[PDB]
Design a protein around this ligand. Structure first.
Ligand code: NA
Ligand code: NA
Lengths: 605, 605
């Protein structure tokens, strides 16, 4: 008949259950992930100029790249029923297909994939590099993006520059930029490529190239346009992790206040591969998902000079972001009236980058997800008090103007928000509000009403008095609660962090190996701000999106922290105010929207 | 019982006979060829420093490189019973293994093969080049040369210099040269590599490299050290074919009067791929086997500047020569007392470079041979009369001194002779002489005694009177004669050529397709010479080596012409003087040595 799962009854050791029995247990409904099995790095994204459809791509089951389309940037349709559009086993890629990116209007006016073709394993920053392990090859889709046919020829970039002893040499990211065109005297709308990795005994780098011929055959090397010393860090390591031992999945793009602008300020997103000392062979212990702002100058060779940096996502398991220009002329953007955007999908690895030993993978029969598509833009924070907090250097913001009369500064940083159409679809459920209140004593205060399922958005504002600064205050919410489980998400002034406490999240973590219960944390500074001539600590504008086991925490349009919340019991759906009693907190009216939506309307599961 | 072959009975259409039935018919006994099947370009040759054994290599059955050893430079022992020491089907060479050469004392003190690893076909100078079709990869033999194990990594030279549109890029030839070391400030005893091919719309070239690291990993590009315009020629095309559309099998070495000398004059041997106009797609119609002398200068980049050139072998089917330094310390050289030598094996394609349609290949069950090993050295011709003949430029010799009193010059050219130990073994049979004579009338004069088998050396000197110059004289020998067949080899003053007339050579050519009967020819100038104060036309010192169907014609230590003489009848063994009646000829005493020897004493067939 069936193997019977009752989520009011206690869990077994989940690894004893049949294959596939936990497929729906923790599965999101509003996120990009394959029909089943494993998802790796997103890549390959492109707007098809002929249709306006936006194509998303991702590594799938360690065997190539799968893809789906969206006409609204909310919901998706599988290509090939989820089967890969390109697989390993060719002449150039006999061992593996690694990440690539797409020139949308390329060879023969077709989407043209430049990707890392792998011929030798293992490959890791910590071990000697095997010559020719990573080349860059071309493929073209003549069938609307369902199949990328490999060009019947060798790699267009057969290895790194002469005698370079690389740590890695992969993840080519194609992009256009008129600032680079001007500085390098390139032909207008030249395609550039960055390749990510580093050099042994020197440190991480992006290797920069430009197309030499219109046919994309030859790629002129323009130097290590950005490189950093081995395991160096932005500032003192507080705000933007470390540059660490190797760069991965380098994206390059340019922004203004509204979205993507070719003439805008230049940003990159990168994964950095970190380690404790001594290094453990073939182990990356820290996967930092960073963004970096910088100016580009020339001095013979072009250079990217960082002026601020932060995390695109503070999640331990968050990594490998791939983003793409989405033009205003796209099908989604035409419906929503958006300007040109840069949409980034962050990867949330399902198994601690394959370190989560004993996780019930055969039972779940899927692993990983992408996070919600995110709009990136230049965010301005006005009316900030010109004090030490605002002026700290080596941080994730910079002063772009000042008012000596008012005593204020305008700050600039990277804006991170849920893509507009996806956010609206997330809120299309049924909405209720919980009354605002102030808390001064220690405890958890149940909401009058909680969602009855584990699919909701929670928004609220938290205001703190001057005395919260530098104190032992902890305030936020307790979610996914019942007598056996709870998860707590809170702001903490002592280290200016948002924390997700997962020690009690999962009753399955007590019976089963490989179900991480570590705390997750990210830094967020709330500055001193001036409005109506009154100086206050900035309001914490918190959004929580819970999609079964996927938690995404957003704050103030500039912060994201995402993780796995693998609660077992059907009843673990209650929400409470939380405050540790140190000082006071005022919670606004809290909005809860329940149900989210189905991001995969043409799948049944 | 057996399929019965009687060589006194007329031949059938040979393509109707059983497979293997003609294995012995035309098979040489004193030449390098595999136990059966096809032989292609020789390559891979090396002296093993540990044993003193000389290793020879060759393409075999279109599927990699086979090898044998010699301890005497006369006789050979198969490695692996003739099975290839390296085969295609690796990561770098999934389609084919092309030519390579060996650094004898390389990685780990082991013979280290650098070779062309092929990933895409077709490849031809006349068609567009597929990117990455030819890379250069490393293999090492740790077992005494029976197996060259591919290094488990990508090619060490993944393609040609950036954006070069090559016609070909293959046949790497490793060599050392202190003249290059001095000119380029290279470390002493640096290994150089030439790679042969050309550039589309520019012409043929050798691409020059030097090792960058002691591990042979990286190869620094030093430019097209020698290149020529498309289908240009030395002089007016008389003496050294054409530079043509592509260079193949470039060897580089340096000589003195005795043999190989690192500080000597620099020479190269090359195949050139020719065509009539218009070009026929994928067809090379002319395969010229050239040698070239030149000086090396620097002008920022190093340059090889030809000062004379000729043919290493004038045979239509002669090509692809591979030679190697053989030191005085080798086993063969220690026995024979030779100094350092450069030994070259020329290939004699068995089937007109796969154009001989209908040849009975399945019946023969082998195809091709290498020619006899040849010593190359600087040859001086003294006491030549200083006239137009001696002074002609764009030819195969140059004036290196002059005596105004005597009216003479010393000439310099490339010396080509049978390697000493092989020549002695060829003459180890039973020897007889035929009396000298003068002929003035037209006809063929039978020898009093002829060899009774088709395995012999014939040596003779032909002296011509002053009036032979510019005349219609034709004199030489008729060989392999009976009532049904004959072959005529003669000198002709009208175009200063040695000719092999094959119109009557083979009774099988009348019954069977693909048995070429075209004439073979090569240029040979006999200069005016002064001895005892008498001016004469130089003596023609002729050697003919007939090894069943393999004919090699040598003259004056500076001329070689080789071809197939596929006589059928057991009785086609008679030899006659030949003279066309135009003027007179004096033949010296003619020596005939019969039997040759077995170059493969440990094979039965
Ligand atoms: Na991370
Ligand atoms: Na030839």
């Amino acid at each position: 008949m069936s193997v019977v799962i009752d989520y009011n009854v206690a869990p077994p050791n989940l690894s004893t259950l049949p294959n596939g029995s936990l497929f729906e247990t923790w599965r999101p409904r509003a996120h990009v992930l394959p029909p089943n099995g494993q998802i790796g790095d997103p890549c390959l994204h492109y707007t098809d100029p002929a249709t306006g459809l936006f194509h998303v791509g991702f590594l799938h089951d360690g065997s190539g790249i799968s893809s789906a389309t969206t006409d609204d940037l909310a919901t998706y349709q599988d290509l090939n029923q989820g089967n890969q559009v390109i697989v390993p086993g060719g002449i150039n890629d006999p061992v593996a297909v690694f990440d690539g990116s797409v020139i949308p209007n390329g060879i023969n006016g077709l989407p043209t994939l430049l990707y890392t073709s792998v011929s030798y394993l293992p490959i890791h920053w910590s071990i000697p590099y095997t010559r020719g392990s990573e080349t860059q090859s071309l493929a073209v889709s003549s069938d609307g993006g369902s199949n990328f046919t490999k060009l019947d020829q060798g790699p267009v970039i057969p290895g790194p520059p002469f005698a370079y002893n690389v740590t890695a040499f992969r993840d080519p990211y194609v992009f256009q930029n008129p600032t680079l065109d001007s500085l390098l005297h390139s032909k207008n709308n030249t395609w550039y490529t960055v390749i990510s990795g580093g050099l042994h005994e020197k440190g991480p780098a992006q290797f920069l190239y430009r197309q030499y011929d219109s046919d994309f055959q030859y790629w002129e090397y323009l130097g290590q346009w950005w490189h950093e010393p081995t395991n160096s860090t932005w500032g003192n390591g507080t705000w933007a992790g470390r540059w660490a031992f190797n760069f991965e999945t380098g994206n390059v793009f340019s922004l203004d206040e509204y979205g993507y602008n070719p003439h805008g300020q230049i940003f990159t997103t990168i994964g950095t591969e970190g380690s404790d000392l001594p290094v453990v062979p073939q182990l990356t212990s820290i996967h930092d998902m960073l963004w970096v702002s910088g100016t580009v100058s020339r001095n013979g060779s072009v250079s990217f000079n960082p002026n601020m940096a932060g995390f695109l996502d503070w999640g331990f398991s968050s990594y490998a972001a791939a983003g793409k220009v989405l033009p205003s002329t796209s099908l989604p953007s035409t419906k929503s009236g958006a300007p040109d955007r840069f949409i980034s999908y962050v990867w949330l690895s399902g198994d601690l980058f394959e370190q989560a030993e004993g996780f019930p993978t055969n039972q779940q029969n899927w692993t990983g997800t992408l996070l919600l598509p995110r709009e990136l833009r230049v965010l301005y924070i006005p009316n900030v008090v010109d004090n030490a907090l605002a002026r700290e250097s080596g941080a994730s913001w910079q002063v772009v103007s000042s008012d000596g009369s008012a005593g204020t500064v305008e700050l600039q940083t990277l804006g991170i928000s849920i893509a507009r159409e996806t956010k609206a679809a997330l809120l299309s459920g049924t909405s209720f509000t919980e009354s605002g209140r102030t808390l001064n004593s220690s405890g958890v205060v149940p909401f009058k009403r909680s969602p009855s399922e584990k699919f909701f958005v929670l928004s609220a504002q938290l205001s703190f008095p001057a005395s919260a600064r530098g104190s032992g205050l902890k305030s936020g919410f307790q979610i996914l609660s019942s007598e056996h489980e709870s998860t707590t998400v809170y702001y903490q002034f002592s280290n200016e962090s948002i924390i997700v406490d997962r020690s009690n999240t999962s009753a399955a973590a007590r019976t089963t190996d490989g179900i991480d219960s570590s705390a997750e944390a990210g830094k967020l500074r709330l500055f001193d701000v001036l409005n109506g001539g009154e100086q206050a600590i900035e309001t914490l504008d918190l959004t929580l999106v819970v999609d079964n086991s996927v938690l995404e925490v957003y704050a103030n349009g500039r912060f994201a922290l995402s993780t796995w919340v693998r609660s077992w019991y059907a009843n673990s759906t209650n929400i409470s105010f939380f405050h540790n009693g140190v000082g006071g907190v005022a919670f606004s009216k809290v909005t809860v929207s329940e149900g989210l939506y189905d991001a995969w309307p043409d799948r049944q599961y």
